[PDB]
Amino acid sequence: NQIDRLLTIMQRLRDPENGCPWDKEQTFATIAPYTLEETYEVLDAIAREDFDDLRGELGDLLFQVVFYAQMAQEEGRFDFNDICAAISDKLERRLARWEQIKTEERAQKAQHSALDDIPRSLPALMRAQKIQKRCANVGFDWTTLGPVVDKVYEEIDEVMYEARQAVVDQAKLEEEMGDLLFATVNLARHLGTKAEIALQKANEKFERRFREVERIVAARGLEMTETMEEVWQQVKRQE
Amino acid sequence: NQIDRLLTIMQRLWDKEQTFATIAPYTLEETYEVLDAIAREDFDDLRGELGDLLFQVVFYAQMAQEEGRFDFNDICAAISDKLERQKAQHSALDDIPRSLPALMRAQKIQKRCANVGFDWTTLGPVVDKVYEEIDEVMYEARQAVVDQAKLEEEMGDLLFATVNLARHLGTKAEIALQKANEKFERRFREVERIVAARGLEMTGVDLETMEEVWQQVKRQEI
């Protein structure tokens, strides 16, 4: 029943008169980056496992979904109930998997490439892994794990060859670097992992350690008067 | 009132469960789908994607509810009430949005550390750290029982090491892989064309044939 409050508040926020913000001037395009922002906040409240945070952040994600439904309903396309109607239909007719729902979504109705309908917005690691699995799905993939590792080693040698040259060709060095990164995604994938998520967790790990070394060096403290690699070591230990 | 219906469908529906993950990666994947549908102004796609997104909000609410954490309507209450309405430690790492691509974000973090004196002075140990991470990853991979959490941890760290290499070599990792993604996709598309021109299905060609085409395509560039 609170959902119904949300819906009318959302209605009343765009009520034209009255209205508003601001809200009134938001479109599908202007809400988009907030949805991106908000989804990572959701994923962060999850990683940190706090549910005070998470219940707030899901509220904000919902607010998003309700915002899109309203803007769609204002053009007569659909409303919130039709969104809930269609997922409910799909989940009923099908628990899960989530892969299943997604792949039969795709099954309509390209035509042409393996390869088509890949969001142009995707972070590079997400996009490489998606390209690779699309190609795997049609049978283009390595069959064993070892040549995958070996392709990483080959691309490292390639990168390092370019880097060693008397005159470094920067474009060619960037190209090899790119193929090395692609190869490492192929390995991540062959290992059962998601490359973009894996690096997100390594980023938080490193950031958490660095922040601690900062806290330690700072508490020291004073010093206008290494240091650093040894504290990094200790913080690494205390973990 | 299909809102009530979806909810009760959640109470009642891989089919293991999971958990806050493996849902969370799905929240990220679906969010890009939603933004793409908005970018391509396709409102039929959009309706479906919002259903997919909504379904995860409901799932999160269901797990939360099972744990006694006040649930789908509190979510609604929370945001409604809100809509009717002390320093952290200082850091060189501040203002790097969570939502940047992971590679771009690793490279940004490493530069902040470099600014402040925390970086390798020579290329040798950067290279070493990559080869060492590949040992640690592959070590976890071939263990009789694979610790999945540790494998992913080491896979992450290898990715972070390879960004450090990219950076010390004067390159931006996220852009470099985008351009590798485009090269790969170009060439696979040619292989798709060549096979279609024989009137075959890609799913009806053996891997050896695929590889020989792939090689012809790559020989057709130089």
Side-chain angles (χ1 to χ4, degrees), chain B residues 68-222:
Chain B
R69 314 231 58 167
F70 293 116
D71 115 306
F72 184 85
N73 256 276
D74 193 7
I75 288 169
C76 296
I79 185 59
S80 293
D81 294 317
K82 167 158 102 117
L83 277 168
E84 303 187 85
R85 205 222 267 219
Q86 293 178 359
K87 246 213 106 182
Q89 181 57 217
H90 92 257
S91 189
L93 292 190
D94 283 344
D95 196 38
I96 294 174
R98 221 176 248 100
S99 84
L100 295 173
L103 287 178
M104 172 175 345
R105 200 146 186 283
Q107 189 150 171
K108 287 177 163 4
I109 285 154
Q110 282 169 17
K111 41 219 256 111
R112 289 312 179 71
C113 290
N115 296 343
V116 116
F118 191 66
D119 200 10
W120 286 304
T121 37
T122 59
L123 182 60
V126 185
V127 178
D128 297 343
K129 184 56 161 160
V130 173
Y131 274 102
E132 159 165 50
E133 286 292 356
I134 292 170
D135 287 351
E136 324 199 46
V137 180
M138 299 313 297
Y139 181 86
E140 304 299 338
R142 68 175 173 255
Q143 289 324 289
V145 101
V146 174
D147 188 340
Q148 214 60 34
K150 230 285 190 267
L151 178 70
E152 178 195 55
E153 166 170 21
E154 288 321 311
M155 186 69 236
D157 283 346
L158 196 201
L159 282 165
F160 187 94
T162 309
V163 178
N164 219 203
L165 215 200
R167 180 179 62 89
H168 271 83
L169 261 6
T171 72
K172 296 175 183 282
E174 176 84 16
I175 288 175
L177 177 56
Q178 291 295 32
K179 298 188 172 186
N181 285 333
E182 291 295 318
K183 170 172 95 157
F184 183 89
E185 154 161 28
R186 257 180 27 232
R187 298 182 165 163
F188 189 70
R189 273 165 158 71
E190 299 186 60
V191 173
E192 271 178 327
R193 278 181 211 117
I194 297 179
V195 162
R198 283 163 194 194
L200 312 146
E201 285 291 284
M202 288 262 77
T203 88
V205 197
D206 75 11
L207 187 46
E208 315 224 302
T209 299
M210 280 182 242
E211 305 185 80
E212 69 178 319
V213 195
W214 180 265
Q215 300 151 24
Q216 167 201 344
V217 167
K218 274 183 66 150
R219 287 184 282 102
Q220 258 188 46
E221 272 155 356
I222 54 79

Side-chain angles (χ1 to χ4, degrees), chain A residues 179-195:
Chain A
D179 284 355
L180 196 206
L181 289 154
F182 191 88
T184 65
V185 168
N186 262 140
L187 204 221
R189 188 183 50 89
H190 278 254
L191 299 179
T193 67
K194 285 173 168 175

Side-chain angles (χ1 to χ4, degrees), chain A:
Chain A
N1 216 314
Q2 278 312 284
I3 176 93
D4 284 288
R5 269 222 68 69
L6 190 47
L7 304 166
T8 125
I9 282 152
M10 183 74 255
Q11 200 159 264
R12 213 158 90 259
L13 293 181
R14 279 177 70 97
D15 193 339
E17 26 138 6
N18 302 143
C20 192
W22 189 79
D23 287 357
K24 269 155 75 64
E25 20 200 313
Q26 298 303 293
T27 68
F28 301 92
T30 73
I31 309 296
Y34 299 108
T35 305
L36 187 62
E37 284 174 48
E38 184 62 47
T39 283
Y40 280 91
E41 296 298 315
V42 172
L43 296 195
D44 174 49
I46 291 165
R48 292 195 290 105
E49 323 211 11
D50 91 294
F51 300 64
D52 315 274
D53 278 340
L54 176 64
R55 77 116 94 91
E57 301 301 353
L58 290 176
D60 314 70
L61 222 223
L62 234 214
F63 180 46
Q64 303 280 125
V65 171
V66 149
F67 208 132
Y68 291 125
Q70 172 72 35
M71 297 193 279
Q73 186 186 180
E74 287 176 28
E75 283 168 22
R77 290 167 176 287
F78 49 88
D79 66 12
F80 190 75
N81 179 63
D82 306 329
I83 296 172
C84 309
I87 343 136
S88 295
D89 278 357
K90 198 152 212 287
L91 291 169
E92 224 152 34
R93 202 183 53 88
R94 305 214 92 261
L95 227 287
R97 11 265 165 87
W98 171 256
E99 296 290 277
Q100 296 258 57
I101 279 84
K102 281 302 151 153
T103 326
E104 59 158 70
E105 267 171 18
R106 231 184 320 284
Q108 331 181 126
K109 257 207 277 280
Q111 204 221 286
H112 232 239
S113 206
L115 209 347
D116 291 335
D117 301 323
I118 294 177
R120 176 62 55 182
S121 55
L122 277 187
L125 293 167
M126 294 189 70
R127 187 180 188 83
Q129 184 143 183
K130 185 169 280 291
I131 284 148
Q132 288 173 11
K133 172 70 184 317
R134 297 277 198 89
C135 294
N137 285 351
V138 298
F140 190 62
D141 203 359
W142 319 80
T143 48
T144 58
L145 179 60
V148 181
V149 176
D150 185 70
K151 184 66 141 166
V152 178
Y153 280 132
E154 180 187 2
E155 296 298 342
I156 293 171
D157 270 326
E158 226 76 77
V159 168
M160 287 325 293
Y161 181 82
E162 295 302 342
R164 267 135 202 190
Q165 288 302 97
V167 207
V168 169
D169 183 352
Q170 205 56 51
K172 224 299 192 283
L173 175 75
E174 179 186 55
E175 172 182 11
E176 303 310 314
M177 187 49 59
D179 284 355
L180 196 206
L181 289 154
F182 191 88
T184 65
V185 168
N186 262 140
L187 204 221
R189 188 183 50 89
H190 278 254
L191 299 179
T193 67
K194 285 173 168 175
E196 174 90 11
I197 297 148
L199 178 56
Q200 290 170 357
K201 291 165 160 203
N203 284 342
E204 295 294 318
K205 188 170 86 162
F206 182 100
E207 171 141 22
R208 191 212 313 119
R209 290 175 179 169
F210 189 73
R211 284 173 113 114
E212 181 66 2
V213 179
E214 279 184 319
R215 185 223 130 227
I216 296 178
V217 163
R220 244 125 207 241
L222 295 175
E223 315 313 63
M224 281 172 82
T225 4
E226 283 71 6
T227 305
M228 273 190 307
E229 187 49 50
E230 318 95 41
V231 194
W232 182 270
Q233 255 98 73
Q234 170 205 326
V235 168
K236 218 161 142 74
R237 258 98 73 169
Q238 77 193 195
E239 255 160 14

